[PDB]
# Entry
Amino acid sequence: EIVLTQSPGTLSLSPGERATLSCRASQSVSSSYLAWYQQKPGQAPRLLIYGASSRATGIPDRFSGSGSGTDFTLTISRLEPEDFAVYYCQQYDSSPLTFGGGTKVEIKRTVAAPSVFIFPPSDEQLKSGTASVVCLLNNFYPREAKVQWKVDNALQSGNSQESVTEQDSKDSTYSLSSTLTLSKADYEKHKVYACEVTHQGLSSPVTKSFNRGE
Amino acid sequence: VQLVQSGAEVKKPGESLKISCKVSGYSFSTYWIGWVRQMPGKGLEWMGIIYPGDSDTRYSPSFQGQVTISADKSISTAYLQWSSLKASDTAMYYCARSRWYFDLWGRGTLVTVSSASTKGPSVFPLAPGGTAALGCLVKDYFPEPVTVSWNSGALTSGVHTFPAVLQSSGLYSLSSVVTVPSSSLGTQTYICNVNHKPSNTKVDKRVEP
Ligand SMILES: [Cl-]
Ligand SMILES: [Cl-]
Ligand SMILES: [Cl-]
Ligand SMILES: [Cl-]
Ligand SMILES: [Cl-]
Ligand SMILES: [Cl-]
Ligand SMILES: [Cl-]
Ligand SMILES: [Cl-]
Ligand SMILES: [Cl-]
Ligand SMILES: [Cl-]
Ligand SMILES: [Cl-]
Ligand SMILES: [Cl-]
Ligand SMILES: [Cl-]
Ligand SMILES: [Cl-]
Ligand SMILES: [Cl-]
Ligand SMILES: [Cl-]
Ligand SMILES: [Cl-]
Ligand SMILES: [Cl-]
Ligand SMILES: [Cl-]
Ligand SMILES: [Cl-]
Ligand SMILES: [Cl-]
Ligand SMILES: [Cl-]
Ligand SMILES: [Cl-]
Ligand SMILES: [Cl-]
Ligand SMILES: [Cl-]
Ligand SMILES: [Cl-]
Ligand SMILES: [Cl-]
Ligand SMILES: [Cl-]
Ligand SMILES: [Cl-]
Ligand SMILES: [Cl-]
Ligand SMILES: [Cl-]
Ligand SMILES: [Cl-]
Ligand SMILES: [Cl-]
Ligand SMILES: [Zn+2]
Ligand SMILES: [Zn+2]
Ligand SMILES: [Zn+2]
Ligand SMILES: [Zn+2]
Ligand SMILES: [Zn+2]
Ligand SMILES: [Zn+2]
Ligand SMILES: [Zn+2]
Ligand SMILES: [Zn+2]
Ligand SMILES: [Zn+2]
Ligand SMILES: [Zn+2]
Ligand SMILES: [Zn+2]
Ligand SMILES: [Zn+2]
Ligand SMILES: [Zn+2]
Ligand SMILES: [Zn+2]
Ligand SMILES: [Zn+2]
Ligand SMILES: [Zn+2]
Ligand SMILES: [Zn+2]
Ligand SMILES: [Zn+2]
Ligand SMILES: [Zn+2]
Ligand SMILES: [Zn+2]
Ligand SMILES: [Zn+2]
# Structure
């Protein structure tokens, strides 16, 4: 099958600027049979471009496409707020009609360090036999960050899960939660619970911690 | 033109399933129509297309023999079916008209495949230098979705309701947090309102310092 490579994986740009998205094919695509789609969170994809360069019905002039053979481009010439989304290319020449892996266009803004908060488990949850510890990283940019859990100063792998918000509409930041879950019996075998956060906006890592029961 | 897809499905592994896409507003029998998978957090995957005029099919090798695509032109409906679902079939499924590019899309059908049974969430407080953070942990529910508001919707600024995660147990969990002035903790009440319609659960939790 034809493999489509989209680059970069993420573009970080400002409103009004031009986004140029790339789609490279492992074998030549015949007749410029390359399409581009937009997807916003919670919504179905929609067609932008077909035939490498033709605008779909109702698509505004700021979207354009070009290329042939193995190299194709999508241009969003003036980024409007709605345009910060994920974009997929697809070849529809040879079955199977493969998609690329997507490029996200995000809003670039100044670096913002996370504020970090830790939450011990509630007594209500502890009564039920489980302990969830939550670490919150609030309103940071760029998206890259590292969170580590430490219990009695030992690193924890395999017992936490993370979740990240979409980019904030007011200040273009991200937020992230990490939840460490233990049985109550295991939680009571240890004292110091800590999450450690590294980020470009921090001069050194930030640790928030609590002592169980104290 | 409308492509109207059938409602969300919640199934056990091994069960069969047929989902549908009913079209109106164009000649169903003279355009290809097909299916796209999207697992939560992933990109789009092409499954196959069918020409309803004579039911010719084109399948992806990664889906052929696991699914069947079919069409009934007398009721302008296309179908996607599995004879034996796997948990890895949990995904959103879109139908779309194929030119062969996809020019008109349905709104998608969510398919969840799990041995889990319907369960309402437990809601626990995340109890609280200028800013303070508080929240609610909405744990151990199935299937999706839950909705969360704060103060019956009067508190929206500073709220982050995170995407759900699927736990190893097979139940979902999410947190909803909000940042507020530290000075307000003595003086304002903060309540998270949680609704899980599949289990008919409504829960309000006051979050106190
Ligand atoms: Cl492959
Ligand atoms: Cl490449
Ligand atoms: Cl990148
Ligand atoms: Cl502008
Ligand atoms: Cl050409
Ligand atoms: Cl538009
Ligand atoms: Cl425009
Ligand atoms: Cl414009
Ligand atoms: Cl996005
Ligand atoms: Cl900025
Ligand atoms: Cl409690
Ligand atoms: Cl590590
Ligand atoms: Cl013991
Ligand atoms: Cl342990
Ligand atoms: Cl241990
Ligand atoms: Cl860290
Ligand atoms: Cl059947
Ligand atoms: Cl044809
Ligand atoms: Cl999947
Ligand atoms: Cl997938
Ligand atoms: Cl999910
Ligand atoms: Cl399975
Ligand atoms: Cl599976
Ligand atoms: Cl559409
Ligand atoms: Cl399962
Ligand atoms: Cl269960
Ligand atoms: Cl401070
Ligand atoms: Cl959800
Ligand atoms: Cl919600
Ligand atoms: Cl979610
Ligand atoms: Cl989800
Ligand atoms: Cl409610
Ligand atoms: Cl309460
Ligand atoms: Zn391959
Ligand atoms: Zn390369
Ligand atoms: Zn890259
Ligand atoms: Zn997104
Ligand atoms: Zn979705
Ligand atoms: Zn503008
Ligand atoms: Zn628009
Ligand atoms: Zn925030
Ligand atoms: Zn991470
Ligand atoms: Zn905000
Ligand atoms: Zn901000
Ligand atoms: Zn231990
Ligand atoms: Zn470290
Ligand atoms: Zn989901
Ligand atoms: Zn996949
Ligand atoms: Zn035929
Ligand atoms: Zn083949
Ligand atoms: Zn499957
Ligand atoms: Zn639990
Ligand atoms: Zn006040
Ligand atoms: Zn209520």
In short: Chain B touches chain A through 44 residues (CB under 8 Å). The two ends of chain B are 54 Å apart (CA to CA). The CA atoms of residues 194 and 205 of chain B lie 8 Å apart. Chain B has no helices and 19 strands.
